[PDB]
Curated annotation (Swiss-Prot):
Pfam families: SBP_bac_1 (PF01547). It is found in: Periplasm. One of its GO terms (biological process) is maltodextrin transmembrane transport. CDD domains: PBP2_MBP (cd13656). Its main location: periplasm. This is Maltose/maltodextrin-binding periplasmic protein. Part of the ABC transporter complex MalEFGK involved in maltose/maltodextrin import. Binds maltose and higher maltodextrins. One of its GO terms (cellular component) is outer membrane-bounded periplasmic space. GO terms for molecular function: carbohydrate transmembrane transporter activity; maltose binding. The complex is composed of two ATP-binding proteins (MalK), two transmembrane proteins (MalG and MalF) and a solute-binding protein (MalE). NCBIfam families: PRK09474.1. It comes from Escherichia coli O157:H7. The gene is malE. SUPFAM superfamilies: Periplasmic binding protein-like II (SSF53850).
Length: 614
């Protein structure tokens, strides 16, 4: 479990773990509290597993970005340092450990990419290579294949990953396509076509070139310094050049110390971190085992700044931007990796490659999660290839906080595909919470039966019967002992005073073949009185070319957005109602509205036909 009156700390093997242990020994010496320092293999991967249990370490040491995921799950505690302690650390480092307006960790170290040799501007480098190539060398050689290294000039003029709003990042405000991003990336390909730089240059080539004295400059980080020290090159470290009178913005990696929320030793971790480790002597002890580069502590940074290399990694960091703590970043990197490659290799123009990457980073199904096999709780049958493909798309809906439509033709096992989602959300996620399933009366008994065949594990209630029979089910609900609740549309409408009181995790409505008039009265109640974030619709029809049906589908998928607006006429006339004119849509206007809604809903519907399956 998680032992009281003691401290267990996890830090990576590539860090000053033995140095940190001495700070722990000094803590035990003065207080009596034992401090255990461990470096487990893939600790960033083991931490979310053990912390969800209520086990693992009291303190975790990792970069602030991975801490964003843990903070969302609620695995890390809201740290409570006084104003006076916060004033000791650089204010920007606290922003790296802020999640939903809460300090979730104590910043330790700081890392950013640096210019290693100087050219004050990027613009002055084409000239410099002319000289160096006459002498038999090259002015610059860095890893181009990876977007982490190429990004600082792209971000310089105006480029950005996600726009940082008041407190949070916007995963829809992506700046891979603006004037700035294009200006920077055009300059990069300019240098490639002028033969100053080669597009085939990777990490191994860029490194071996600077070490063998073949190139005058390179862009890397502190991790390289060790391998260049052993190369006897008279290298220096400075700030990255200014593009268009604006500085280059590299990504800032802040080593942080996070407190586990399952730990009974929270005040002990505050005392050890604030008073033993986040001190000049405390950081110095770690820095002696394995250097920390720049540090968040003003006092110890001013002293380390005597070394120009450390004052450099700190100049770059203050001028750059901190790495976003959100999982959407994986889609942004996979976008800009291929964007930069294609542009430079000539396979796409700058304006083309960036257009795609901007579309791909802002895509709804940003977070990817492979589904190889089905859930263990799903037995007495094996899910077909398209049915597994359907489970992967439905988990992607849950992962990216999207509502969706499974419009597969009747008899494609939508029922089994739904059942398979619930089982995977229990096996691989801790989502056992109440599931609402609204089915047609005709197939109610087939749903209760299919659950019995495929997932006997899943304890379900069947909200059906005479008034007295339903009143009998009331206590089992209040317990929350159940996993699923199956019912017809009439009991959602009639027995709202009992069913609306539950905090439904996921909610599923199966309309069968076609939707009916009573499906809208059902959603009118569902929207007003019921609480369910995630929603899924099971239909047999494809996306209709009728505005009333699309209006309905919209109110089912986005219940919040259509509060004040009752009709599609009021909704789509809104940009034209400034004069108080009341005119309905016409044939043409309506065709274009249908067209746009089909484009808008495209990533929320999954349909397969029988002729393309088998
Ligand atoms: O729309 C659907 N299926 C579907 C299937 C294939 N293509 C299309 Cl376009 C649609 N199903 C469907 C299932 C359940 N509840 C609704 C609804 C509604 C609603 C809520 C509030 C106000 C109004 C209103 O009418 O003011 C309507 C729609």
């Amino acid at each position: 479990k998680i032992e009281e009156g003691k401290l267990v700390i996890w830090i990576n093997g590539d860090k000053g773990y033995n140095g940190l242990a001495e700070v722990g020994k000094k803590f035990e010496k003065d207080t009596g509290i034992k401090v255990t320092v461990e470096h487990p293999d893939k600790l960033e991967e083991k931490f979310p597993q053990v912390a969800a249990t209520g086990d693992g370490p009291d303190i975790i040491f990792w970069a602030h970005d991975r801490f964003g995921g843990y903070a969302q799950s609620g695995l890390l505690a809201e740290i409570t340092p006084a104003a006076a302690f916060q004033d000791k650390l650089y204010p920007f480092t606290w922003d790296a450990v802020r999640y939903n307006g809460k300090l979730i960790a104590y910043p330790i170290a700081v890392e950013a990419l640096s210019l290693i040799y100087p050219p004050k501007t990027w613009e002055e480098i084409p000239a410099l290579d002319k000289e160096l190539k006459a002498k038999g060398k090259s002015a610059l050689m860095f890893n181009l294949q990876e977007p982490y290294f190429t990004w600082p000039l792209i971000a310089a003029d105006g480029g950005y990953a996600f726009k940082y709003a008041a407190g949070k990042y916007d995963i829809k405000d992506v700046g891979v396509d603006n004037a700035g991003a294009k200006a920077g990336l055009t300059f990069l390909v300019d240098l490639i076509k002028n033969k100053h730089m080669n597009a085939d240059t990777d990490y191994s080539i860029a490194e071996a070139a600077f070490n063998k004295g073949e190139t005058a400059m390179t862009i890397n980080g502190p991790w390289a310094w060790s391998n260049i020290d052993t190369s006897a090159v008279n290298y220096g470290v400075t700030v990255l050049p200014t593009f268009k009178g604006q500085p280059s913005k590299p990504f800032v990696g802040v080593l942080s110390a996070g407190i586990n929320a399952a730990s009974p030793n929270k005040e002990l971790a505050k005392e050890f971190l604030e008073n033993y480790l986040l001190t000049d002597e405390g950081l110095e002890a770690v820095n002696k085992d394995k250097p920390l580069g720049a540090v968040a502590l003003k006092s110890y940074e001013e002293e380390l700044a005597k070394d120009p290399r450390i004052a450099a990694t700190m100049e770059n960091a203050q001028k750059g931007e901190i790495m976003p703590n959100i999982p959407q970043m994986s889609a942004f990197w996979y976008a800009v990796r291929t964007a930069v490659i294609n542009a430079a290799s000539g396979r796409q123009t700058v304006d083309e490659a960036l257009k795609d990457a901007q579309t791909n980073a802002a895509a709804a199904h940003a977070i990817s999660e492979r589904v190889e096999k089905q859930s263990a709780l799903l037995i007495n049958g094996t899910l077909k290839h398209y049915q597994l493909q359907g489970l992967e798309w439905m988990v992607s809906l849950y992962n990216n906080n999207l509502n969706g439509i499974l419009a597969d033709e009747m008899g494609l096992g939508k029922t089994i595909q739904t059942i398979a989602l619930i089982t995977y959300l229990m096996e691989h996620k801790r989502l056992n919470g109440p599931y609402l399933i609204i089915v047609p009366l005709s197939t109610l008994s087939n749903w209760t039966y299919e659950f019995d065949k495929w997932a006997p594990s899943v304890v379900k209630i069947s909200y059906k019967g005479t008034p007295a029979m339903r009143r009998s089910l009331v206590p089992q609900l209040r317990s929350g002992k159940f996993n699923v609740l199956l019912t017809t549309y009439e009991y959602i409408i009639k027995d709202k005073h009992i069913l609306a009181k539950i905090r439904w995790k996921y909610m599923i409505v199966d309309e069968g073949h076609r939707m009916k008039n009573h499906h809208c009265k059902l959603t009118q109640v569902l929207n007003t009185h019921y609480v369910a974030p995630r929603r899924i619709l099971l239909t047999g029809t494809p996306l209709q070319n009728k505005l009333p049906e699309l209006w309905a589908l919209l109110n089912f998928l986005l219940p919040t957005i259509f509060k004040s607006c009752s009709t599609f006429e009021q909704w789509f006339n809104a940009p034209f109602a400034m004069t108080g004119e009341r005119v309905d849509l016409n044939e043409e206007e309506t065709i274009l509205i249908i067209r746009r809604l089909h484009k808008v809903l495209r990533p929320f519907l999954l349909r397969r036909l029988k002729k393309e399956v088998e």
